[PDB]
Structure formats: C-alpha cells, structure tokens
Ligand binder design. Structure first.
Ligand SMILES: *[C@@H]1O[C@H](CO)[C@@H](O[C@@H]2O[C@H](CO)[C@@H](O)[C@H](O)[C@H]2NC(C)=O)[C@H](O)[C@H]1NC(C)=O
Ligand SMILES: *[C@@H]1O[C@H](CO)[C@@H](O[C@@H]2O[C@H](CO)[C@@H](O)[C@H](O)[C@H]2NC(C)=O)[C@H](O)[C@H]1NC(C)=O
Ligand SMILES: *[C@@H]1O[C@H](CO)[C@@H](O[C@@H]2O[C@H](CO)[C@@H](O)[C@H](O)[C@H]2NC(C)=O)[C@H](O)[C@H]1NC(C)=O
Ligand SMILES: *[C@@H]1O[C@H](CO)[C@@H](O[C@@H]2O[C@H](CO)[C@@H](O)[C@H](O)[C@H]2NC(C)=O)[C@H](O)[C@H]1NC(C)=O
Ligand SMILES: *[C@@H]1O[C@H](CO)[C@@H](O[C@@H]2O[C@H](CO)[C@@H](O)[C@H](O)[C@H]2NC(C)=O)[C@H](O)[C@H]1NC(C)=O
Ligand SMILES: *[C@@H]1O[C@H](CO)[C@@H](O[C@@H]2O[C@H](CO)[C@@H](O)[C@H](O)[C@H]2NC(C)=O)[C@H](O)[C@H]1NC(C)=O
Ligand SMILES: *[C@@H]1O[C@H](CO)[C@@H](O[C@@H]2O[C@H](CO)[C@@H](O)[C@H](O)[C@H]2NC(C)=O)[C@H](O)[C@H]1NC(C)=O
Ligand SMILES: *[C@@H]1O[C@H](CO)[C@@H](O[C@@H]2O[C@H](CO)[C@@H](O)[C@H](O)[C@H]2NC(C)=O)[C@H](O)[C@H]1NC(C)=O
Ligand SMILES: *[C@@H]1O[C@H](CO)[C@@H](O[C@@H]2O[C@H](CO)[C@@H](O)[C@H](O)[C@H]2NC(C)=O)[C@H](O)[C@H]1NC(C)=O
Ligand SMILES: *[C@@H]1O[C@H](CO)[C@@H](O[C@@H]2O[C@H](CO)[C@@H](O)[C@H](O)[C@H]2NC(C)=O)[C@H](O)[C@H]1NC(C)=O
Ligand SMILES: *[C@@H]1O[C@H](CO)[C@@H](O[C@@H]2O[C@H](CO)[C@@H](O)[C@H](O)[C@H]2NC(C)=O)[C@H](O)[C@H]1NC(C)=O
Ligand SMILES: *[C@@H]1O[C@H](CO)[C@@H](O[C@@H]2O[C@H](CO)[C@@H](O)[C@H](O)[C@H]2NC(C)=O)[C@H](O)[C@H]1NC(C)=O
Ligand SMILES: *[C@@H]1O[C@H](CO)[C@@H](O)[C@H](O)[C@H]1NC(C)=O
Ligand SMILES: *[C@@H]1O[C@H](CO)[C@@H](O)[C@H](O)[C@H]1NC(C)=O
Ligand SMILES: *[C@@H]1O[C@H](CO)[C@@H](O)[C@H](O)[C@H]1NC(C)=O
Ligand SMILES: *[C@@H]1O[C@H](CO)[C@@H](O)[C@H](O)[C@H]1NC(C)=O
Lengths: 90, 463, 463, 463
C-alpha cells in the first residue's frame, strides 16, 4: 500500500502551523483526509479550509500562502531554496 | 490577527559586481567607511568528573542483590577503571591548557587600562563582566562539596531536592573542578596583563608594557589602513570599538548561538547523570526496580530471577554511561588543545588567516572562562560604502623607463583628491584616503608594461 | 599466457645526493626545468538527513504490535529526538560553511576569464566541468521529493523499484538537501569572481578585479621564480597550467583515490538505509519477521511472544542506527569546519605551508561541490633537471670589508652564464636563470666571514 | 620516619610585574641570559592490524558449534569485512605519511654532521640514539612471523608462552607492519639529510647542503637575537644546545609524559587482543566456555542450548572488538595527518606560531619513529635574568621633525652601555646587547609624537 508521510511546520511564537505531505504531491491532496494520520486536523482547517494545497519543490503544503518573498532565515527553512515565513504578531 | 505562514525563498544576496577591465589599468573598489563588530564562540573543554560505587548503584543495600551482583563484579571493576582513566585525562587537559595561558611577565592591571577603549572585561575587583554574564545567565546548577550533607540531612531545610542529595542513595559521586575560580581568574588576569602588545617581534622574551589603544592602532596599520587616517580618527575608532564591545551586553541571550552552546555543555552533563539516576527506578523486564519490593512480595525461588534481571539491567546502564563518557572525554581533549592554539594565535597575536574570529581579517580577541569551557570574543572588520576608482599596477618615470615603483600595502590610483595636484595618489588597501605618492608608501621594482608613466611629478624617485 | 605472481620488494627511490662542502662556499642544486601537475582531495561534509516513524517502522500497521510497542514508546522518543538533533547539526554546518564561501564583492564572470589559462571550471551557462564529471561519474541514486509518490503508486510505471518507494512501507523518510544546486552554484560562482586576486594586501576590504593569468604570475614570483623568466615563458607557463588542468579529464575515475572517497560518501549513506530496510525482514529469534504471519499461523498465547521478540529486535536496530548517525554527524561537522579554513587558506589565498595541496609549495587551488561534500583541486610545483653550481652565503666589496650584501629570495652563484662578465650572478630560489647582481635582487647586510669578495664589479654597492 | 600527608595549596607563581608608564617612553623588560631546553610529544599513528577466523574463534573445531554457528554466519562476514576496511585505512595512512617524509634531494650524512652540535640522532651505522632508547625502554612484545611456528610447536623450547602461539588455537592473526625498520629508517635519514636548511626561501626546489650549526644561527637571528651576540657566543650556544639535547638521556623514563604515551599505545593494542583471547574462556550464561565439556557431560537436548549461549556470547565479543577497532583506526588516521603537517611545519621549517613545540618560540625540531607512532623532540627558548630599561617607540632628528626612524626587529633604548657615547642604543627583541643605532638595525618611518628626539648623533639619517 502507499501512504502519505507528514511533517508539521510549527511556530511557538504565533501558535500556528502549516503542513507538508512531501512526495505525495498536491494532485492527491485535499483539506480533508480519509486515510488517516490523527483523529483531528481542525487546527489547520481554521485557515486551510479556504485554500487549495500549494505545490512546492520540497513537498505539497496546506496553509502556505504564495507571497513571492525572499528571506534569509524563517527559522522554519524547508530546505532546498524554500522557507516557511511566520506571520507578524498584531 | 496573524494569518497563515507565507511562501518565501531562501534569499541569496548577490555580491557587488565589479567589472573587469583590459590593458594596464583597473577598477578598484575601495571602502570609504569602516566600522567594527564582534563574533563569538564557545569551546567546551570539560566533562563533569564522575565516580560510581557499583555496590550501591546496582542495589540499595540489599544482600540478595550483593550475592548475585558478586557474579558480575568484574564488570564494575571495568566501569570504575575506565572512568578513572577518563577523569585523569580531564585533569591533564585542564592543567595543560592553563599552563599555556600563564605568562612569565606581565603588566599590572588597574582600572583605566584600555585608555579610550572601554574594556568591560577588566577584573571587577576578580573575573570580568563577561564571566558574570555567562555564569548568571546560564542555568547552571549549584555545586555541593561544602556544606553539603547537612542540607540533605534531616538537620537542614526540608525543601532541599538537590540531585546531589540523591547521590547519597545512588552511590554516585560528583567530583570537584580542578582549578577553582580564583586560579582560573589568575590565569586570565595574566593574559590581560600581556595585552599591549604583540608587536616589536618576539614578545616571547622581552615585554613592552604599552597602552591598549596603541596596540589597536598598530593592528589597524597592520591591515592596510594608513597612519594619517588613524591619527585623525583615533577617537572615532575608540568609539566604534566600544560600540562593537557594547554588543556583548545583549550577546548573553538564548538567541546567541555561542551562548546556546555554553548552555548545552551544561545540559549535556546534567543528562548524563539524570539518565544514571532515572535508570535506578527502571525495571529491566523485572517485576520491580526495587529489591525491597521484590523480596517483600515474592517467594525466594522467584526473587532471585527478578533481582538478576535488575542487576543485569543496572550494569547495562553503567556500560552505556561509561562508553559515552570515554568518547566525550576524548572529544573534550581535542577541543582543549584547539583552544590552546587559539589563545596563542588570536588572543596573544594578530591573525592573518581569515576564516577565524571576526568576519573580516583580525583585530584583538579575548578569552574568558565559561561554564564547562572557554568563551571567546573576536573583534572583526566590516568596511563599507565602497567607491570605484581607476588604479595602476605600478608607476614609472615617463622620462626614464628604468625608474619604476610599486605601492606598499596599498594601491596607486588616479588622483580624484583635490588636495593632490599630482595625477596619481596612494591609498591603503583597507581604506580610501589618497595621499601624495612618496617613498614611505612605495617600493622600487623591476619595470613592467602595466606600470603607468608620470611625466610630471613622482617624488619616488623624483629624478 | 601470464604466469605466477613475482617476488619484488617495495621500492624506495633514494633522493638525489648533494655533497656537503666546507668553508665559505657550497654546492647548490638548482632546478632548470619546471613543470606543473595537480593533486586532489574530497571532503565529505554531509550525512543524508533522516527521520523515522517508529510506529510504522517497528510494525506494518498491526494493532497487536502497537499494543506491545506501547510498552517501549520511550525508546522511539529517544530515537527521533536524537536524530532531530543530528539533522539540525547537519543544517547548521552547511549554512555556516557556505556563509564563509560568499564574497561581499566580486568580478562578473564571462567566458574568456582565464586568459591563456583554460579554466574548464567556469560556469557552463551553472556549475563547472568538474561538477558534472563528479555527478555523472559517481553512482549516486535519483532523488525523490517531486513527483515522488505517483511513480510508487499503481498510477505509474510498474518497473519502479526505488528504495524511496519502499519508504511508504518502512516508515522511513529521506529528507531534502539544505541548499539546492542553484544556491550552491551561486556560492561557488562568488568564489570564482573573487579570483584575481589575493595580492595587494587585505582584499578583505578592496577589490582589484584583475586577470587570472596575472594572479598566476604574481604567485610564481612568490615562490622564488624571477620576473624575467616569467615574462619570457608566459605562454609556456599557460600551456603547462593547461596540461596540469587537463589531467582532471581522467581524474574522475575509480583509480583516483579522491574520487573513490566521493563514491564512498555516497555508499555510506546508502548502507545506512539499506541496513534499516533489511532489518525489517529479519527475525530476532522470532518465528517470523512478519506480524501478519505470526498472527495468521499462531494461537494468541504464542503470538505475543513472537511479536515481542520482533519489536525488541526492531528497536535494537533503531538504536544502533542512531548511535551511528550521531557519530557520523559529528565527524562531518569537523570535516566541514576544516573545509571552511581550507577555502580561506588555499582557494582564497596562496599557501606557504607545504604538506597541503599540490606536492610542491603552492599555486592556485579550486573548490567545487561534490556528492556529499566538497572537492578540491590543487595545482603543485614540480621542478626538475637540477644542476649543481657553487654558491656564496653573501658578497662583499673586496676593497671595502663593510660593504656587504646578501641575495633576496635567491642565491649568489659563481657565474657560469656567458652573458655575464661579472664573476658572480644571481638566481632565484626556485629557478636557474643567472642575472647580473643588482640592487633589485640584493639586500645590504652585516659582514660575515662567508661572504665572498669581489674586487671587480658588484653594482650593489658599486662603490 | 615519615609522618602524615600535609595540607598544601596548589601553587600559582605570579608573573613578573612590569609597571606601565605614560607619555612617550616605557619600561622594557629585556632578558640578559638565554638558555635552551627541550619538550617532547608522541603521536600514535598505528593500531595493530588484525584478522579473525570466526569459525575457529567461536568454537575450537566442534561440529555442533559449526552447525549452530552457521545460523549466525552473516555476523562474522560483517566482522571480517569491517576489519578489512580498517586495516586498509591503516596501510593508506602509513604510506601516505611516509610519502611526505621523503625528500627529492638531500645531503649525505656522515659522522660529524652537526659541527659543534652533538646530534646524537645521527644514524648509528641505521636508526638513532632516540629510537633505540624508545624501543629498548618500552615494554613492547616480540614479533612473530619468522621463525614463528617452530617455537610454538613441540619441536621447540617448552617454555614458549607467546600470545602469538595462542593464535593457532584462537583463530586470531596478528598482521605484519607495513614499512619494516629499514624503510622507516630510509625515510627519516632523508629528513636528516634535508637539515641545513630551511632558509634562502623555497627549498622545495633548490638545495643548499650547508652546516647544521649555521641553520641554528640563522634561526636564532630569526627570533630577534642580533648577529654580534651570536658570533661571540657561538661556542656557548653549541654547548647549551648539547645540554638541552643531553636531557633526552633521562627523557625515556616512566616519569616522562610523552614516554608514557608511547607505552600506552603499546598497552592499548595488547589489551585489544588480550580481551579477545580471555573471552574464549568466558561463559556467557552457559554452563561452560568449552564445547568439548558441554558435549562430554550433557545430553544432546541440553548441549545445543549451552552451545548457542556460547556462540552468541563469542559473537557479541567480536562485535565489541570491531566497533572499537573502527573507532581507533579513524582516530589514528587523524593523528597521522596531523603528524604529516607537523613534519612539514617544525621539522622541515622554523615555527612562528608559539603554543607548539618548545615552550618559547621555535628552534629546530626532530622526528623519530616510535612504538606505534612518531616521537618528536623540540628545542625551546628559555630567556631569563631580565632587566628593566627605558625605551622609545622610535627616534627623530631633533633638528628635523621629518627625519624619523623605528627599530628593526628590536627596540631603541636609552643607552646604559658605556661603550656607546650616543644617548640611544639598539637591542634585539630577544636579547639585551646594546648596539650603536645604525641603518642595519633601523627603518625610516612616518613621524609620530612618541618618537624621541636626538639633537646629537643618530647615523640613521646622520644628516
Ligand atoms: C559611516 O558610518 C557611520 C557609522 O558607522 C555613519 O555615521 C552615523 O550613522 C548613524 C546611523 O543611524 C547616525 O545615526 C549617526 O548620527 C551618524 N553619525 C554622525 C556623526 O552623524 C556615517 O554617516 C557613515 N557614512 C559616511 C562617513 O559617509
Ligand atoms: C563604557 O564604560 C562605562 C564606564 O562607566 C560604562 O558605564 C557603566 O556601566 C555600568 C553597567 O552596570 C554601570 O553600572 C556604571 O554605573 C556605569 N558607569 C557610569 C559612570 O555611569 C559604559 O556602559 C560602557 N559602555 C559600553 C558600551 O559598555
Ligand atoms: C610606461 O612607459 C614604459 C616605457 O618607459 C612602457 O614600457 C613598454 O613595455 C613594453 C613591454 O615589452 C615594450 O615592448 C615597449 O617597447 C616599452 N616601451 C618603451 C618606450 O620602451 C610602458 O608600457 C608604459 N606604461 C603604460 C601603462 O603604457
Ligand atoms: C571624483 O571627483 C569628482 C569631482 O569632484 C566627484 O564628482 C562629484 O561628486 C559629488 C558627490 O556628492 C557630487 O555632488 C558632485 O556634483 C560631483 N561633481 C560633478 C562635476 O559631477 C566624484 O564623485 C569623485 N569620485 C569619487 C569616487 O570620489
Ligand atoms: C623540460 O620539460 C619539457 C616538458 O615539460 C620538455 O619539453 C617537451 O618534452 C616532451 C617529452 O615527450 C616532448 O615530447 C616535447 O616535444 C618537448 N617539448 C619540445 C618543445 O620539444 C623539455 O625538453 C625539458 N627539458 C629542458 C628544457 O631541458
Ligand atoms: C582548452 O579549452 C578548449 C576550449 O575550446 C577545450 O576544447 C573544447 O573541449 C570540449 C570538451 O567537450 C569540446 O566539447 C569543445 O568542442 C572543445 N572546443 C573546441 C573549440 O574544440 C580544450 O579541450 C581545453 N583543454 C584542456 C586540456 O582542457
Ligand atoms: C671577504 O673579505 C673579508 C674582509 O674584507 C673577510 O673577512 C674576514 O673575517 C674574519 C672573521 O673574523 C676576520 O677574522 C678576518 O680578519 C677578516 N678579514 C679581514 C681582511 O679583515 C672575509 O672572510 C672574506 N671572505 C671570504 C669568503 O674569504
Ligand atoms: C658551466 O659552463 C661550462 C662551460 O660552458 C659547461 O660545460 C659545457 O657543457 C655543455 C653541455 O652540453 C657541453 O656540451 C660542453 O662541451 C661543455 N664545455 C666544456 C668545455 O666541456 C657546464 O656544463 C656549465 N655548467 C652548468 C651547471 O651549467
Ligand atoms: C646565565 O646562565 C648560565 C647558565 O645557563 C650561568 O652560568 C653557569 O651557571 C651554573 C649554575 O650552577 C654554574 O654551575 C656554572 O659554573 C656557570 N657557568 C660559568 C661559566 O660559571 C650564568 O651564571 C648565568 N648568568 C649570567 C650570564 O649572568
Ligand atoms: C656528545 O657527543 C659525545 C660523542 O663522543 C658523546 O660521548 C659518547 O657517549 C656515548 C654514550 O654511550 C659513549 O658510548 C661514547 O664512548 C662517548 N664518546 C666518547 C668519545 O667518550 C657525549 O655523551 C655527547 N653528549 C651529550 C650531552 O649527549
Ligand atoms: C620629537 O620632536 C617632534 C618634533 O620634531 C615632536 O613632534 C610633535 O608632535 C605633536 C603631535 O601632534 C605636534 O602637535 C607637535 O607640534 C610636534 N612638535 C613640533 C615641534 O612640531 C615629538 O613629540 C617629539 N618627541 C617627543 C617624545 O617629545
Ligand atoms: C645601568 O648603568 C648603571 C651604571 O653603570 C648600573 O649601575 C651599577 O650596577 C652595578 C651592578 O653590579 C653595581 O655594582 C654598580 O654599583 C651600579 N652603579 C652605581 C653607580 O650604583 C645599572 O645597574 C645599569 N642598569 C642596567 C639595567 O644594566
Ligand atoms: C507563486 O506565484 C508565482 C507567480 O509567478 C508562481 O510562479 C509560483 O510557482 C507560485 N508558487 C506556488 C507554490 O503557488
Ligand atoms: C577592451 O578594450 C577595448 C578597446 O577598444 C574597449 O573598447 C573595451 O571596452 C575593453 N574592455 C573592457 C572590459 O574595458
Ligand atoms: C674540506 O677542506 C679540505 C681542505 O684541504 C678539502 O681537501 C676537503 O675536500 C674539504 N671537504 C669537502 C667536503 O669539500
Ligand atoms: C603619569 O604622568 C605623571 C606626570 O606627573 C607622573 O607623575 C606619573 O608617575 C605617571 N604615571 C606613570 C605610571 O609613570
């Protein structure tokens, strides 16, 4: 059987996160899942329910938002030439 | 409120592009504005010293345990002797390192050493501002040794919960440090008194006992800044130094990578013991980690099996501990020898290597003691506001093809300085400040096709 | 056809014997024919990054396994956190190394940089000839990450057998590289633009943007070759350089030790995973490595025992893996810091240390990226065809005992050059090419008994 | 008779205090009496090479054992291949190190090389006095290989108890050294012939073939001692050298830390085998460590269980051995490369780094072979009897503010030497010996406020 690997990008300052499915790619990704990896996905759904998955060279990610920015260090680098930038506290 | 994390790429900031020219002249990018800053590193040199009383560690005073433990006595012999070796290596490393720190002669230090340079590292008579910042900011646990036992005894505060008190049951002992704070302070005060300076050659013989500030100015000439620039900006330079040093006020933070490493040296020793201690409550396939409970609730024919699992379990954890300590000791020994060389390369000398220290050639470095090691601070050079001028590869008397010169520790540039009437002027290699071209800044060389020709005025040679 | 192996001794090729002389003169062996060649080294700086989903790794989705695995959950917590630490160290090492690679300013590079020097390392716009040779010649496996899953899914080629596809069952994940090829290329293109040159002092400030070839000629004067020799042979020198560089065309071979090391860095990562993967099919005293088969053919009272052996077995293999990865990570961290210094010592500078680089002092070195690390190339000096001449320790005016000189970066020899009428002539220290003795090649010194006396013509001083 | 141990503190010997002065002059502490001494170090470069015949190691020729051992055959495959890799690394390290030792050209060495310098290290034609002292003093065991077997056979002395003889039963084999004593001697005789000298620049090209003593005098000028001092004391210097070298006569003692390290390299290899050998008699929860006794006194249904415990036990000990050998090999590889650089930094060159070698700058170092590695000796500088004089930062012609000089590799001091009428005199940086201030000891500099003014006589410039 094939499966979906998962990783979570978590910001302890804003108390938020985004997630990657890696190699699975976004053609097989939706905001809801019937696989499953955990009982609930609601912490992501709060924002992710309004976005489709965004495909990146690192992997397929929910809650990514395309901003076309370049930053030196997000403290959440995704490797390669990609970075998950935390938002700004009010 | 905040939204979703954003997609950004990792930035690469492209270098300033300096176009290449053909022929006998070139575009030379020269900084016009210089400032200082600092970098830091931590060198862990120690592993906390350890000994274990196996008879007590494996079982808390039980004869059935000792009767079965006896079958395994050769194991604990290996454990203590292996640790004996590692603790000796730790002591030799520490004394051998401090031996290189000590000077044969030095200047006395009184407040005011540093001149216009703040030197917040002068002993607060003592230690340094930096040592107090490291020892107060890092969450390093209180030592025992004295008074010790009374605070772990019923004849003391009921609130004591020190991991040291637990040693009276664990059969574990924490060993004292080799030097004490006062001797370590004596060794680094000897280094402070050795500052000013590292010039005049040798210094491994004679001793000048000169101002801090002058050793700085000598080092700045040493990187290509001319003297006229330093003389005019000497107060500005002291202020920039002080600003760069001032950065250390915020440096002892969790966002400082060198600081974090100091904290980990502490944490790494804490876990080595916490793991030995927590294993004392771990079952090893055994019904209980407690011999007393094994005996109390089991018939004798079953108790030995439960105890044997416990013993082999405890011995297994001692094995892992020792293997880890032997590796840690050797890694620390390497680290200490590398520090020995750094003190003799950057603290006691100016570096010409790059890579090392401040990220821009080298200017004075300092070493202080730190939890489990040494902490180093390095002042670096950060030139900016570069301009582009056209430069020569050398100069010849136009009227005489064999009269040729080259710049010394700098460049000959087309004059753009209105105070110089002469077509060519000299700048240092690290700072733009065109000077008349004179013999102090030049050397006589074999003629080359790329040396530019002056038909007017070139004092070196004038004729 | 071939016969038996033969008895031979290991050869030792005796050094050229140069007889020692007494008194004030000596036999000086001087090369007359110089050529270049190259040496290579590989620095492994990376360990492939790893994470493991223990719940899946130990058992492939079985509840009985999870029920028993739960008793051991603290084990896998240690495994993932230990690997978390090692992967962070790998990332810090890589970014900290590239940070030293990047220049603040550099020359643009276009085809033609190098002048008469081939420079096959210029970006093939990109990377370098060398990087393609290493990446195409080394048997390094295809990456996943994108497209990934579709080629391991039934909705893809039936022929896929990637070890990455196996990760979907193993619970193992391969992590992406930190930099990407394009950023690594940006960092080494920044180094290429920093070439020409490392002279004029500093260079950690200003930037000359001059020809490659000239930086070579400056380095050659820097080892004792005089300028007249370089000027006459400048085209020959470029050709010898190109021949030495041309050697790299055959260098990416299995008979090349540096190349072999690159291949092993790849193989070492491949085995770390192959071992975790093959252990999934290994019994551990268990009837089967398969939970599904343990359940299917055994009554429940026996199944738990077989499963517990399997679990402890799988956990044991995770333990060994992590211990190995922690050691490999620290060794790689040391390797990366050593590379940091080499880039700042040989790529960005001329070396005066010997031992290092080409086996004969130093001439330009280059660094390129390589599978799991960096690959360095070093041009070395290989002088030959030595001759024997008689030399002085210095020279004095025979008519005036206080007028004494010594050679600069060379020797005074009895003239055997028919173009020189004077009894004494000067050669460099690295090449025989007698020149008239003049002030450009001499220094004034205190008189010594071993300086030879010239009663005829010695321009330094003439009178 | 002796009493109780006494309470003493660890001493710290305070450095000589040199007071700091304000203004344009300072107190300069200058040694007046110089002497030499030596320091030593041992670099272990080898691990004794090993192979194991698992079939014999685990069980001494028993079929029941082999039948059960077969189930574990993949284990021993890993053991031999891992050791194969480690032994190859050991050989590559040794040949790669000696390759750097060998010179392309050298002087022949005959007794008398050294001049007035004893050089007890000249080959005793051979090796050196030092190598015989290390090999005769260290308790290193006799090699086998030839004749070997006859002395472990009944056709030989009944008294042989060599651990090598035990290998015929253990299934263990000790491997031969890579170089032999004669080739190692050839490589270090090549280094001896390369001495005199490391000056004249390059030396990586041409070869001077000059006296030992002169290379010493050149190195002494190289640390700031003036030539007049060396010329007058040249016989005294040779005697001090010989005294410093003479110290090596007592150095090969158990109280010598470098010596002790040589002894441990030997002991560490001895224990690696002694442990494999003693494990052959160890039970592993088994009734007996002897298969023959397990079979003889037990029914077959019980014998397999006892044998399986034994086998897994023996295999476990092989595992630990290999893991230890792999680590030891890599540590030795690092050590050998560090030696490669030291030979090319201190033996083949004068060091300017401090930290290293003799504890006082650097003067000639030597390398010899040692049990399991290399042994180095380093001559150091130990100046004493310092005096205090007042010195300048430079000097100007009082009648002309632009005529300014600075000392070269020394200091300008107020004259206290009655042979000098002039108010100022020059000393070197490493030795007090005031000289007239002349151009040989000075350089022309930009004027500074701290240069003292001479209104009388200052030859540089006179006018
Ligand atoms: C050179 O650098 C210095 C600082 O290193 C600049 O001077 C200061 O810049 C800060 C930036 O906020 C100002 O707040 C200070 O007020 C400035 N100093 C003064 C005296 O005004 C300086 O402007 C830079 N540029 C040059 C010299 O061209
Ligand atoms: C420069 O040196 C002065 C010395 O006075 C520092 O000022 C002192 O800072 C300490 C910090 O706790 C105070 O307790 C003292 O009271 C201050 N002294 C005075 C006279 O106010 C100053 O902070 C240093 N500057 C930097 C950048 O470190
Ligand atoms: C400065 O003048 C000198 C001559 O004084 C020029 O030297 C030339 O060098 C080339 C190199 O071989 C010779 O072929 C020419 O014949 C030399 N010229 C003369 C007049 O002899 C030098 O090139 C001039 N510098 C520049 C930058 O033009
Ligand atoms: C070289 O000298 C010229 C002439 O003085 C400089 O040009 C002036 O630069 C200043 C900069 O603020 C401008 O305000 C002036 O208007 C410029 N003058 C003219 C006529 O345009 C030039 O910048 C100098 N170059 C360098 C590198 O110092
Ligand atoms: C100096 O070395 C060069 C090569 O580095 C020698 O010249 C070439 O030697 C090769 C050897 O096969 C020949 O095939 C080439 O034809 C030679 N070159 C030429 C131009 O003929 C040279 O002979 C050596 N000896 C010297 C200069 O004395
Ligand atoms: C020197 O540089 C030339 C540049 O032309 C190299 O010649 C090229 O080599 C590549 C190798 O694949 C060929 O694809 C090109 O077609 C060649 N160019 C031409 C014009 O033929 C030459 O090989 C280099 N020499 C060395 C020793 O590397
Ligand atoms: C070159 O001539 C000088 C004298 O001009 C010789 O110097 C001798 O040095 C020794 C050393 O003490 C003195 O004892 C002699 O008295 C000096 N000679 C004179 C005439 O004063 C020097 O030795 C000669 N060089 C050679 C190689 O013979
Ligand atoms: C020093 O000069 C002499 C005289 O020119 C050289 O001797 C000649 O060497 C060539 C080499 O091919 C021979 O063919 C000649 O026959 C030799 N001449 C005589 C008279 O025998 C000598 O080789 C030169 N030495 C060096 C080191 O260059
Ligand atoms: C300088 O040091 C030397 C020794 O390095 C001293 O001379 C010798 O000192 C020893 C000490 O026991 C005596 O036994 C010798 O007899 C002394 N030599 C002579 C020739 O008497 C010397 O005294 C020291 N002090 C100086 C030069 O002031
Ligand atoms: C200085 O060199 C002499 C050379 O003679 C050494 O004296 C020899 O020492 C060896 C040691 O066993 C004796 O076997 C020889 O018989 C001695 N030779 C003579 C002529 O007596 C002397 O010991 C060396 N000094 C030092 C300090 O090593
Ligand atoms: C030696 O004499 C020179 C002058 O010949 C003194 O130079 C002084 O330097 C300061 C520095 O700015 C100037 O302000 C003075 O005006 C200079 N003096 C003169 C007369 O121009 C130098 O200080 C004297 N050295 C000492 C140690 O006193
Ligand atoms: C500087 O010169 C003075 C005068 O010669 C030295 O003073 C003499 O030192 C000797 C040392 O044995 C005494 O015996 C004399 O009695 C002293 N003379 C007087 C007048 O007291 C002084 O020591 C010298 N200083 C240095 C560092 O050499
Ligand atoms: C973000 O937008 C840019 C617009 O050009 C596009 O090229 C890029 O692929 C987008 N990335 C994602 C993850 O949508
Ligand atoms: C090269 O020389 C030519 C001469 O006409 C000039 O036009 C060209 O711009 C020069 N190249 C550079 C980079 O200056
Ligand atoms: C030493 O000097 C003598 C003087 O006659 C000479 O014969 C001998 O050959 C010289 N030794 C060497 C090596 O030249
Ligand atoms: C500093 O200068 C004053 C000038 O009167 C002098 O008295 C004092 O002793 C000097 N300090 C030192 C250390 O010489």
């Amino acid at each position: 059987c094939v499966s979906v690997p998962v990783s979570v990008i978590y910001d302890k300052e804003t108390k938020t996160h985004a997630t990657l499915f890696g190699s699975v790619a976004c053609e097989h990704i939706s905001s809801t899942m019937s696989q499953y990896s955990r009982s609930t996905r609601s912490m992501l759904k709060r924002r992710d329910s309004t976005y489709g998955p965004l495909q990146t060279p690192v992997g397929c990610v929910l809650g990514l938002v395309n901003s076309s920015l370049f930053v030196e260090d997000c403290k959440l680098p995704l490797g390669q030439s990609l970075c998950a930038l935390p938002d700004t506290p009010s | 409120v905040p939204g979703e994390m954003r997609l950004a790429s990792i930035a690469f900031n492209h270098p300033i592009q300096v176009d290449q020219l053909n022929s006998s002249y070139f575009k030379l990018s020269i900084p016009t504005n210089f400032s200082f800053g600092v970098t830091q590193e931590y060198i862990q040199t120690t592993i906390q010293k350890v000994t274990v009383d196996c008879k007590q560690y494996v079982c808390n005073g039980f004869q059935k345990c000792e009767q079965l433990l006896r079958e395994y006595g050769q194991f604990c012999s290996k454990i203590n002797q292996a640790l004996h070796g590692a603790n000796l290596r730790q002591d030799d490393s520490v004394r051998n390192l401090f031996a290189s720190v000590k000077s044969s002669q030095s200047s006395p230090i009184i407040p005011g050493f540093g001149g216009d340079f703040n030197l917040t590292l002068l002993e607060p008579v003592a230690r340094s501002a930096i040592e107090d910042l490291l020892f107060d900011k890092v969450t390093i646990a209180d030592p025992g040794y004295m008074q010790g036992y009374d605070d772990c005894m019923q004849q003391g505060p009921a609130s004591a919960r020190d991991l040291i008190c637990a040693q009276y049951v664990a059969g574990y002992k924490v060993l004292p440090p080799l030097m004490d704070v006062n001797m370590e302070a004596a060794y680094t005060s000897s280094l402070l008194g050795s500052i000013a300076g590292v010039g005049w050659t040798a210094g491994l013989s004679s001793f000048a006992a000169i101002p801090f500030a002058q050793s700085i100015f000598y080092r700045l000439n040493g990187v290509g800044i001319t003297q006229q620039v330093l003389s005019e900006n000497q107060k500005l330079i002291a202020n920039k130094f002080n600003q760069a040093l001032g950065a250390m006020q915020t440096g002892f933070t969790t966002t400082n990578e060198a600081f974090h490493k100091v904290q980990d040296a502490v944490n790494n020793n804490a876990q080595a013991l916490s793991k030995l201690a927590s294993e004392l409550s771990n079952t090893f396939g055994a019904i209980s980690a407690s011999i007393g409970d094994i005996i109390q609730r089991l018939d004798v024919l079953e108790q030995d099996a439960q105890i044997d699992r416990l013993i082999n379990g405890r011995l297994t954890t001692l094995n892992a501990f020792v293997a880890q300590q032997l590796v840690r000791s050797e890694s620390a020994a390497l680290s200490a020898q590398l520090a020995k060389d750094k003190v003799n390369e950057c603290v006691k000398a100016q570096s010409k290597r790059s890579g090392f220290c401040g990220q821009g050639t080298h200017i004075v470095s300092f070493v202080v003691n730190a939890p489990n090691g040494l902490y180093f601070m390095h002042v670096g050079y950060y030139p900016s506001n570069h301009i582009e001028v056209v430069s020569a590869y050398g100069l010849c008397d136009a009227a005489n093809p064999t009269n040729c010169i080259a710049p010394v520790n700098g460049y000959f540039i087309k004059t753009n300085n209105t105070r110089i009437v002469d077509e060519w002027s000299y700048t240092g290699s690290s700072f733009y400040a065109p000077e008349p071209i004179t013999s102090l800044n030049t050397k006589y060389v074999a003629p080359q096709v790329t040396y530019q020709n002056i038909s007017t005025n070139l004092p070196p040679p004038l004729l």
